[PDB]
């Protein structure tokens, strides 16, 4: 061949923390189909927003929006348990089909994105230029979102374990753990990676008895 149809930019969705998760990498030959299984951010979440993104930036907000759509009808469950399979399918004609299927409730929602949607030849080079220009800033943002999701996981898992524990946990441990969770919740609102890790460290220093009980 003298020619290849390829994707000039990454295609993916927004995940928790406002990060782009890539489903189809830059410079992929079409046609192509990739899928990844995602889950819910919160307990008893009834729906997901699929925000489709084109670009090379880690921040969802810094990429081109191709559209969004909801999948409703998710049955009550702990966060992280529902299986929401997302499929990006680019046909020979260069049309992007995005689907989200609930593997429990079997429900499906799709968006179809014409071959002409997204960033023009110029904007593509400006986007590729920015990726490499703001690469350090995108790393820093990425490990703040990682830190934030670890702290949020520790917050939620610890509250769960305080409850399962009931009377098994000394009053002294519970006061100390309760104060640390409040302090961690507050810091998770902020932007300060160091302050999140400090509250995560406080909770881990005071939680040793609770961790034994969770056994």
């Amino acid at each position: 061949v003298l020619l290849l149809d390829v994707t000039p930019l990454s295609l993916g969705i927004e995940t928790m923390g406002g990060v782009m998760t890539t489903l189809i990498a830059k410079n992929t030959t079409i046609p192509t189909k990739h899928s990844q299984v995602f889950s819910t951010a919160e307990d008893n979440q009834s729906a997901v927003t699929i925000h489709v993104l084109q670009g090379e930036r880690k921040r969802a907000a810094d990429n081109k929006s191709l559209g969004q759509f909801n999948l409703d009808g998710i049955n009550p469950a702990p966060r992280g348990m529902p299986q929401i399979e997302v499929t990006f399918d680019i046909d020979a004609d260069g049309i992007l089909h995005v689907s989200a299927k609930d593997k429990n409730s079997g429900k499906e929602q799709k968006i179809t994105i014409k071959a002409s949607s997204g960033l023009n030849e110029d904007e593509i080079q400006k986007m590729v230029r920015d990726a490499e220009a703001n690469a350090e800033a995108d790393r820093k943002f990425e490990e703040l979102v990682q830190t934030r999701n670890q702290g949020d996981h520790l917050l939620h898992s610890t509250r769960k374990q305080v409850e399962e524990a009931g009377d098994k946990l000394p009053a002294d441990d519970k006061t100390a753990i309760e104060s640390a969770l409040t302090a961690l919740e507050t810091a998770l609102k902020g932007e300060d990676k160091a302050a999140i890790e400090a509250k995560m460290q406080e909770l881990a220093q005071v939680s040793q008895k609770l961790m034994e009980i969770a056994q």
């Binding site: 969705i13 927004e14 995940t15 928790m16 998760t21 990844q36 299984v37 995602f38 889950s39 819910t40 951010a41 919160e42 997901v48 927003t49 699929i50 966060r79 992280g80 929401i84 999701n149």
Partner: peptide, 4 residues
Amino acid sequence: PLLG
């Protein structure tokens, strides 16, 4: 791997 989570969506809001």
